[PDB]
Symmetry: C4
Subunit: 228 residues, 4 copies
């Protein structure tokens, strides 16, 4: 709480400061779409690599100041921890060059209207873990069974626990599940439909129950407020 501290804290917690930073995120945003074009990169490639290293310096300063002001309150703030990690990524000198584009998610971290909706969304998840747990177990058990039942004749789709996880996931989205996977399978395993139809019933029932549960946990609130 010294004189220097508060001088900084006045700049950081400024309107102008955020608006500045949101202006840059949006500008880098546009920059990163243009950098997607070889034509654009063939002419103005120099300029945008300059602008990229500028912005990422500015954001390191920005994150350093914010730490000066906020102390370990910073490192217990999700939105700040996010901002930390997306800028840190951008600092390391081939998948990482791409993961840089995750800095545009700073538009979410910095615009309150965005933060609101992301919070609303994420707060739905705790009441889902039990069902997600059930489901992940359901899949593990089926992935094993399928790997034994069909891996040898159908290595592409079932040769491996992971091939089976992937294929079972595809069947749950109902993508080409019959013409793509089960119809071919039955050409060797007449009774394969006894594995896949029950699998599709369980998985779809649980998804429906999952969504009904989000709709109720939501109404539970509205029918506490209106009880007052």
């Amino acid at each position: 709480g010294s004189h220097m501290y508060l001088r900084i804290t006045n700049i950081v917690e400024s309107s102008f400061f955020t608006k500045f930073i949101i202006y840059l995120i949006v500008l880098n945003g546009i920059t990163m779409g243009l950098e997607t074009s070889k034509t654009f990169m063939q002419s103005f490639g120099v300029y945008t690599t300059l602008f990229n290293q500028i912005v990422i310096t500015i954001f390191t300063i920005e994150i350093i100041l914010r730490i000066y002001v906020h102390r370990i309150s910073f490192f217990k703030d999700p939105w700040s921890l996010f901002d930390f990690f997306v800028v840190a990524i951008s600092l390391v000198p081939e998948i990482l060059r791409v993961l840089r584009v995750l800095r545009l998610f700073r538009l979410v971290t910095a615009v309150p209207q965005m933060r609101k909706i992301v919070s609303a969304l994420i707060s739905v998840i705790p009441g889902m873990l039990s069902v997600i747990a059930l489901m992940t177990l359901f899949f593990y058990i089926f992935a094993i069974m399928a790997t034994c039942l069909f891996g040898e004749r159908f290595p592409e789709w079932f040769g491996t626990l992971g091939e089976s996880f992937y294929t079972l996931f595809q069947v749950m989205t109902l993508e080409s599940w019959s013409m793509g996977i089960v119809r071919p399978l039955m050409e060797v395993y007449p009774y394969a439909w006894v594995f896949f139809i029950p699998f599709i019933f369980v998985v779809t029932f649980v998804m429906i129950n999952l969504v009904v549960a989000i709709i109720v946990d939501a109404m539970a609130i509205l029918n506490q407020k209106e009880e007052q």
Copy 2:
């Protein structure tokens, strides 16, 4: 508010007038389905091109009168602004010859039972913009990543930000997402599933949360009325 004015206003705000106009929309409606057949156009093509230019004169008169009556109250009315734009389109002397068929939407503008439902539908959208914003950002960031990760080997699906937007949209509808796109992709990018499964989870979760939110914003009303 002169004597001539009110003479017109009595005709325009008439029952007979609307019923007349709804009769023509329905008749032009039928006309435009028959004009779809070369056989029909080979014989009665003369007749229907007559009828088309008649109706569109009648509708210009109609829109001119309505402006006489309604003043700048007209140009702050969505339903009237719509009617203006669909008839204006039909006035310009090859995509435009087709866009003419948008005049059949005048059946919505003119039948109150229709206007009601279109209003109910459109009023749902403001409470969606935040999530739509989040989603459009989510897509922009993924469209960029995918264009870098897969464009070079997969130009058809990812060579361009726009190719990537289109392909990501297809993956969100779950259309051929695995047999069509990701299974082919993994034949070169074993770990592509780490991009597409998380993408499908986020996008589907948000869609579910979107719909749950429409169901709650709706119940919020019914549990204000019943609080009275």
Copy 3:
């Protein structure tokens, strides 16, 4: 209300009578599944064609008695009008030989637990007509546009209003909409995505709003009862 009348009315409105008829529907039911097999029809084909003509006599007697008892109260009863029409069909001496199997729906007409659910289901529809109207208009207008824009190069999918209706219906279910239809279309019509993505947005939005509306019209009731 004579002595003969009431003698009949006592038989018709009997328990035993219904249970008898439900026993036959279930038995004809089983019969019609076995008649599906050439093997079974090669041996026991005589027997089941006997049993079929027996049951359909019995049901004509049954429907005649029920008319004796119920008068024009019969011909203002949906469930009875249904029973009339499915048995009448079965009386006419090649699609009609197949439509006979609609008599198994008599299991719905005759079992109250079934009638209940069918009523619950059908009562949902009146509050849908407006949206269905909107949608059918939406389709008519798009079916026309698509027939003009793509019929000439894509006759199979768009050459005709009806081909276009069918194809647009397929796009609304999202079945092969991109790999099957729009990706092929863009190979000649780069901008076809400007027709199909907006079409998919509108159609999906309306379906969601339709379902949210069924969920509210349902809650409107539960929050009238609990207002008492």
Copy 4:
């Protein structure tokens, strides 16, 4: 209620006991994933077949003790009846070697947080039987019609009641229903769309009504509690 009895009952109803058993389920769980790999089975195959026969002895002891304690209260407990049947399966000396993996569902039987969600899920089903009955009848009648209408030219998809059940199920999930099945069918049966579009409408409507009904049966409860 003797001295020996209670000595056992103190062990069985122990914390330590369950935690032990949950530790083994999780350990066998891991074991059964590794047993999925020929590499792993080529080296450590001996070890895991040992561990498998150990665990399944331990679980037989476990189930025997639990019966000693619980009497016919055991054989009227779903969770215990389940545990009985999954271990019994594992005791019989080729599909059965695979069905063994169903013992990992003991993680559901033994973890209360899991039991809770499985109960929530299963309790939804009684209020669905009527609609499921309606649907199964709907399918039986359509499966018959389709087998007659398309089996002869389309044996793969319709030659048999069961082929037709399977194909109708695929059409209900909307998987390749038009490009895969109906478009091919119309190449011989122009009017096949009059069978499949109505089938898709009915089936989808009922599914929607089914889900709306789960959402209401759920709200019926929350608006009994808040009536108190």
